[PDB]
Design a protein around this ligand. Structure first.
Ligand SMILES: C[C@H](C[C@@H](C[C@H](C[C@@H](C[C@@H](CCN1CCCC1=O)N1CCCC1=O)N1CCCC1=O)N1CCCC1=O)N1CCCC1=O)N1CCCC1=O
Ligand SMILES: C[C@H](C[C@@H](C[C@H](C[C@@H](C[C@@H](CCN1CCCC1=O)N1CCCC1=O)N1CCCC1=O)N1CCCC1=O)N1CCCC1=O)N1CCCC1=O
Ligand SMILES: C[C@H](C[C@@H](C[C@H](C[C@@H](C[C@@H](CCN1CCCC1=O)N1CCCC1=O)N1CCCC1=O)N1CCCC1=O)N1CCCC1=O)N1CCCC1=O
Ligand SMILES: C[C@H](C[C@@H](C[C@H](C[C@@H](C[C@@H](CCN1CCCC1=O)N1CCCC1=O)N1CCCC1=O)N1CCCC1=O)N1CCCC1=O)N1CCCC1=O
Ligand SMILES: C[C@H](C[C@@H](C[C@H](C[C@@H](C[C@@H](CCN1CCCC1=O)N1CCCC1=O)N1CCCC1=O)N1CCCC1=O)N1CCCC1=O)N1CCCC1=O
Ligand SMILES: C[C@H](C[C@@H](C[C@H](C[C@@H](C[C@@H](CCN1CCCC1=O)N1CCCC1=O)N1CCCC1=O)N1CCCC1=O)N1CCCC1=O)N1CCCC1=O
Ligand SMILES: C[C@H](C[C@@H](C[C@H](C[C@@H](C[C@@H](CCN1CCCC1=O)N1CCCC1=O)N1CCCC1=O)N1CCCC1=O)N1CCCC1=O)N1CCCC1=O
Ligand SMILES: C[C@H](C[C@@H](C[C@H](C[C@@H](C[C@@H](CCN1CCCC1=O)N1CCCC1=O)N1CCCC1=O)N1CCCC1=O)N1CCCC1=O)N1CCCC1=O
Ligand SMILES: COc1cc(CCNC(=O)c2[nH]c(-c3ccccc3C(F)(F)F)nc(=O)c2O)ccn1
Ligand SMILES: COc1cc(CCNC(=O)c2[nH]c(-c3ccccc3C(F)(F)F)nc(=O)c2O)ccn1
Ligand SMILES: COc1cc(CCNC(=O)c2[nH]c(-c3ccccc3C(F)(F)F)nc(=O)c2O)ccn1
Ligand SMILES: COc1cc(CCNC(=O)c2[nH]c(-c3ccccc3C(F)(F)F)nc(=O)c2O)ccn1
Ligand SMILES: COc1cc(CCNC(=O)c2[nH]c(-c3ccccc3C(F)(F)F)nc(=O)c2O)ccn1
Ligand SMILES: COc1cc(CCNC(=O)c2[nH]c(-c3ccccc3C(F)(F)F)nc(=O)c2O)ccn1
Ligand SMILES: COc1cc(CCNC(=O)c2[nH]c(-c3ccccc3C(F)(F)F)nc(=O)c2O)ccn1
Ligand SMILES: [Mn+2]
Ligand SMILES: [Mn+2]
Ligand SMILES: [Mn+2]
Ligand SMILES: [Mn+2]
Ligand SMILES: [Mn+2]
Ligand SMILES: [Mn+2]
Ligand SMILES: [Mn+2]
Ligand SMILES: [Mn+2]
Ligand SMILES: [Mn+2]
Ligand SMILES: [Mn+2]
Ligand SMILES: [Mn+2]
Ligand SMILES: [Mn+2]
Ligand SMILES: [Mn+2]
Ligand SMILES: [Mn+2]
Ligand SMILES: [Mn+2]
Lengths: 179, 179, 179, 179, 179, 179, 179, 179
């Protein structure tokens, strides 16, 4: 095994790791080789899980963490009961309170570049966009950050905790220069 | 076993299935033969469970999911402590906040026909009526939908998810044309 | 064993029964003989448990359900940190929100007689008094019922459910004419 | 073993004891000899745990209960995402709602002496200070007690319960005259 | 509810009760009315469970405790892999060590009458027969009791414990004169 | 609380302690006062539990650890299915393999004095007698020690471990000179 | 989803299904399309699990159910501590008692054809071969069936139970004519 | 953290890791620095755990995995009930069947050098000695290996699995050249 893989298994809880292994394998990647992609999907999975935990009881429908067909089924059921436009690509969450899907991005570049690139890929204007980064900076559409400051600051802290742990194990540099 | 039965056991959590088996057998039906009635009572059971989960901590007394005699006991205790009129037929919930019983219907026809038919069977005007359907449409008495928009839209989504899963297994058509 | 005892073990959850057995034995009574006292302390224990569950997260300190010495220790710690007067007899709860102890009574007589008798035994005016009965009637000091209408009506319903179950087993009559 | 140690193991839940054993051993002390320091760190650990439980869902980041390096990592991540000043010594909590770290002290002297001594050791003015004592008295910076009266009064009661239990076992006197 | 029913729920573990409720309802009986049949199937279910527990690790295939169709499926699979004759009626166990099915009877008459009646109903000579009674007497085909003396004497004791508990609750007499 | 009581709660697992509290209270004693009797019944309870664990799967019926009436019920069922003589006093176990009841004694005197005294109290010759002591010495009827040397030596070790723990807490001397 | 897939999820316990999903995806297959291969690997996984359960406590090292690299690691450790020849292909078990690896095959053809084909693929003579089929027939190298008759007959029964369940759902025919 | 530490946490189950952390800290070492000593005590802990699992039900008293004082207490109780000589240093197990203590060594040198060195340190001839190594070789006193070949070969395999995992992570070389 790799050094990064062992770090992934000791920093992220097992359920998040199992979902990341299932997600990458459903797209042909192997967690034991593309190990920094392994850490990325784990990090992205934890961020969305904390994000939907930031609301009430059932404000959010979690799209991420399901296989492509079941995730599109919930997308279909959401679209064809609320009336919203079906997105071109799979989002990560659906905000019932705000009646909009959310795409959540976790980047190691500037929140400006990453938002611009995914806002380009999305093109469909309806779905909300919300980016975090491993430095503590965040950016959202219309500056509408959906959650309150306390929930989002928990996410920024967890991200900086991961970058710190990667650096003390000498794996942050390759993780940075691999996105 | 039937194909529908296997779908029922893999789509609804085991506790809901056990309650549905107990409910149908207490009325002489067998889940392994009347399999689309098996899916209906499971669907109806999940909807009411989500419905009472939509309130505070103890807003709702769940009438559905108990055997006829224990369910009438709670109905008696509710009626003879609050003062409300004892219903002619067994409701599904009791709203303490609103001081009224609720009958919850899940239909594959128009919410208008199904409401009209059960409002006819109820006749007793006190108990509230609330219908959902597998298309995302809902209808309630006095347009009083009891729950907020977020909780009810979760129920509509789950219903459309079930219809989608039934269709990909070729069982939605017989399920539709069997109510 | 007795018929009432078997009913007590099948109607009240095991933790409440274990506490009732411990409470009665600490005062020389045996649950297997004084069986209707066994049902009374179980009923009284469940009512107080639902009562403190009716508040926020930690509004209530539960006095009932502890042995005499540990219960007086919490009473001491409560009195000697808030400043309230130490009661002559052991209460059942302590309301931090209202800064007062509560004595909870469950009776099979008129709420008026039972309140009057315990208000006589208490004499110390500080601690709040709140009575329920197996008919759905309640009475509290200064008409201050502490909890909201939804929480108290849950307690009245549970009480009428117990009386109904006792009656169908022919044990309500002796339970009534034994208090 | 010591008498105090046995009391520590029977009064504090095992998870708090395990954390206290880990905390003291990471600083060269042995719980089986410095047994009243063993009770102190257990008491301090429970107080902070109740303290962060006094907020919403994720108002507080718990600093206490982690080893020195992981605790400083969260401190780093907190500081370098919110922007606050990194404290000279390890605090116990971080209040996101109030955007400030908290140092929690549990003393057997006057809240005035203990606050003054730690306010002297801290010197860095940013982090909040909050002291409790085994008599029910508390003191906080700017008289800003962070939590509501109900949560803090739970902590004062638990403290007086511990002192009472220590006294009936003859160990309060040495515990007092050892801080 | 009945007095016997409450005794059934407090003497037999819940899994055995659930199986008995499922078994009787699959044959049109209601546990709440035919309550002594309810105790009989519970007693019969526990005896067979102890019986198969009396062997090695996987000496016995349990036929009892499954619904009619799944029980016949295992009967089919057993018959059509070992080669034994398929029985006319559903047995309770299958002994691999001895290569024979077992029918287990629990009676309140003489082991001689009960064996004779079921040996008459079976007619198919292959399947083994083994009877216990609430007095401690047992009888098996060819005097081949399958299990050792220690396992069978546990079953006789449990049976006499049940009869004793029924008698102190005044329900043994009707239970006896109802088979 | 007492020092011995705290030692009892930290040395014996909670289930054994709960049984000891129930056993002593059923005979009018209070664990918080007669604390060395509290340790004795706990020690006696653990020894019998290890003893019956020393056999096969179901060699032993545990008589100890039940209340007087349920323990006599099993005694009745054992006697009136095996045919053995019903003992004058309650034994602790029943050996099916050897077809005899066992009385287990744990003493702090010489195994000779303790055996002689209980062999005097028993008088009924049928039931087996087996004594252990906190020094590692054991004595059984006809020198028939029922279990193998490995199981009995585990019991002697556990006993000497308890005496050692009591001595380091200064409570062995009063425990010795109290039997 | 497919009808076979739903049957796979309701007939095999979830841990076996998760392993089968992981095993097939590690070789590029998707359980939701190659659904009868999905049932085959599940069936093969359960058979090997029952097989190693047929021995003592730790007679067998399970090779099947691990990913290719971890399975080869145990193969390496086994070979390079016992001294046996490292097999050309991955076996399913390692028998320590017999000091040989085992390849377990579950077929829907004649045990003769399936054994011959895999004995051809293995070529390395050391590793043992053991075939079962859905009719109850088995064949092993040197007629050495490793396990006793009771354990192997459990496996044959489970296999015939699966074929029966597949047939009543109309999926046995395609499952047969797909190997 | 270190790379080795992350490997230790992902290869050994958490209970073994917690014991190793407690064992090293009780002797002044820190698992996060002396990380290959961290892997050694974990490996040594797992080997002894498998070793005592290799016997009957209670053949072995586990000495390793307790703190120095509690481990010496069991040593005292063992010595002063069986009569064996108290060892100069703490052993790892006590074999009741063979009436002797066992010292278990796991080495990365030749089993001959390691045995000779510890046989020199022990000097007390009574206690048995048993060495394993990461190559699959073992050596015991009088060639008495206590366990059967199947149990010991499981231990040799697990050891070679650990060395393989260390090598693929580049940490075996420093682990070898550090003993
Ligand atoms: C700690 C808590 C766990 C929870 C995550 C989340 C996990 C699963 C649901 C469970 N699974 C597994 C597959 C089928 C299925 O249903 N997933 C993944 C897809 C969306 C979803 O719900 N869970 C479980 C309980 C409710 C819930 O939200 N949370 C929330 C805080 C952070 C975190 O980890
Ligand atoms: C997930 C959670 C489960 C809960 C459903 C509900 C289940 C039972 C109570 C348990 N049972 C079984 C029979 C006796 C009994 O008491 N039933 C059925 C009758 C009414 C009722 O409460 N539960 C259990 C915990 C509290 C509760 O509401 N929920 C709520 C969200 C959706 C869902 O499934
Ligand atoms: C369902 C839930 C249980 C809870 C009751 C209550 C139980 C105990 C605490 C546990 N015990 C046992 C003795 C030592 C101890 O600590 N008791 C008794 C004295 C006061 C108290 O807390 N519990 C447990 C979890 C938190 C809590 O309140 N509730 C609340 C709803 C109705 C009900 O039953
Ligand atoms: C009762 C409940 C428990 C909770 C305390 C707290 C415990 C741990 C998290 C668990 N551990 C152990 C080490 C790694 C780890 O994650 N710790 C310690 C450091 C901060 C933290 O969270 N827990 C667990 C569940 C969530 C939580 O807050 N509470 C809250 C009320 C009083 C109390 O005891
Ligand atoms: C205590 C232990 C339980 C065990 C009984 C038995 C229970 C079930 C299997 C579980 N269920 C439920 C339905 C689907 C299913 O699989 N049933 C019933 C049909 C045959 C069978 O196995 N169990 C469970 C573990 C293994 C086992 O034998 N025992 C054995 C001693 C007395 C007793 O109660
Ligand atoms: C560890 C294991 C536990 C077991 C002790 C014993 C406990 C109870 C049965 C549980 N209870 C509680 C009251 C009603 C009831 O049934 N009691 C007490 C009376 C006789 C008896 O069985 N248990 C539980 C599992 C099976 C068993 O023997 N053991 C055995 C080793 C030492 C020990 O503690
Ligand atoms: C019922 C019992 C379960 C057991 C199967 C087996 C399961 C796992 C071990 C658990 N996992 C999961 C991955 C990492 C890991 O360790 N696997 C798979 C590879 C080999 C192995 O052991 N288990 C678990 C307990 C011990 C054991 O053998 N059995 C045995 C009877 C039939 C059955 O299902
Ligand atoms: C898997 C199984 C676990 C078992 C190891 C062992 C663990 C503990 C006992 C638990 N603890 C923790 C401290 C106080 C205490 O009692 N320890 C450590 C000292 C000796 C001992 O028993 N356990 C637990 C159950 C019985 C047992 O032997 N095994 C055995 C196979 C490999 C393995 O890990
Ligand atoms: C699992 O791997 C995948 C998966 C897909 C399809 C489903 N994925 C999303 O819907 C998706 N994917 C990404 C992403 C994209 C490229 C590299 C890494 C990631 C990242 F962050 F996961 F780590 N970010 C999101 O935020 C996001 O919602 C495509 C490609 N790779
Ligand atoms: C379990 O089967 C039954 C049960 C009964 C008596 C108790 N039932 C209700 O009280 C009830 N029954 C129905 C319903 C009615 C006919 C077919 C299907 C259903 C449906 F939806 F369950 F699937 N809808 C409700 O909403 C509802 O509250 C009558 C008949 N069948
Ligand atoms: C357990 O039995 C006891 C206990 C005590 C001392 C502690 N008890 C209370 O503090 C107490 N006792 C009663 C009560 C009094 C008489 C009969 C029955 C009850 C009742 F309801 F429990 F069922 N009601 C309360 O509300 C109440 O707080 C005295 C006498 N009996
Ligand atoms: C575990 O033992 C230790 C630990 C440290 C470093 C980490 N500790 C804190 O950060 C800390 N330490 C104390 C404290 C100080 C001296 C004696 C006792 C305590 C007390 F209360 F724990 F019991 N109080 C706090 O409030 C507090 O946050 C220093 C010294 N001893
Ligand atoms: C559940 O109720 C039923 C079930 C059936 C069909 C399946 N049953 C058996 O296969 C069966 N049935 C009986 C039995 C027969 C009559 C009354 C009571 C019982 C008894 F003991 F359960 F309590 N004894 C056995 O030993 C036995 O194997 C027939 C009738 N009633
Ligand atoms: C719980 O307290 C009791 C209980 C009883 C009746 C039931 N007890 C037994 O059947 C019994 N009682 C004793 C024993 C006797 C006197 C003092 C202490 C014990 C001892 F060891 F428990 F600690 N030893 C046995 O071995 C034994 O089987 C009588 C008296 N006290
Ligand atoms: C935890 O660390 C320690 C502990 C002690 C005292 C208690 N220890 C034993 O009783 C002991 N110690 C060793 C050992 C010795 C030196 C280095 C590494 C180990 C090894 F293998 F743990 F990894 N081997 C055994 O087999 C053994 O029974 C001394 C020194 N270090
Ligand atoms: Mn996504
Ligand atoms: Mn995303
Ligand atoms: Mn209904
Ligand atoms: Mn309805
Ligand atoms: Mn009270
Ligand atoms: Mn009261
Ligand atoms: Mn601190
Ligand atoms: Mn502090
Ligand atoms: Mn049967
Ligand atoms: Mn039968
Ligand atoms: Mn006794
Ligand atoms: Mn005894
Ligand atoms: Mn194979
Ligand atoms: Mn050692
Ligand atoms: Mn060693």
């Amino acid at each position: 095994g790799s050094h990064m893989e062992d770090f992934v298994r000791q920093c992220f809880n097992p359920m998040i790791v199992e979902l990341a292994e299932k997600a990458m394998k459903e797209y042909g990647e192997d967690p034991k080789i593309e190990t920094n992609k392994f850490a990325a999907i784990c990090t992205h999975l934890e961020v969305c899980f904390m994000y939907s935990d930031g609301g009430s009881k059932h404000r959010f429908e979690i799209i991420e963490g399901r296989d492509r067909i079941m995730a599109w089924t919930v997308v279909n059921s959401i679209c064809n009961t609320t009336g919203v436009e079906k997105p071109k690509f799979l989002p990560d969450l659906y905000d019932y309170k705000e009646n909009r899907f959310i795409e959540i991005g976790v980047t190691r570049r500037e929140v400006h570049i990453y938002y611009l690139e995914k806002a380009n890929k999305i093109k469909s204007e309806k779905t909300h966009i919300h980016i975090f980064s491993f430095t503590g900076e965040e950016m959202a559409t219309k500056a509408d950050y959906t959650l309150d400051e306390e929930s989002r600051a928990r996410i920024k802290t967890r991200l900086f905790t991961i970058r710190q742990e990667m650096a003390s194990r000498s794996l942050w540099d390759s993780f940075r220069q691999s996105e």
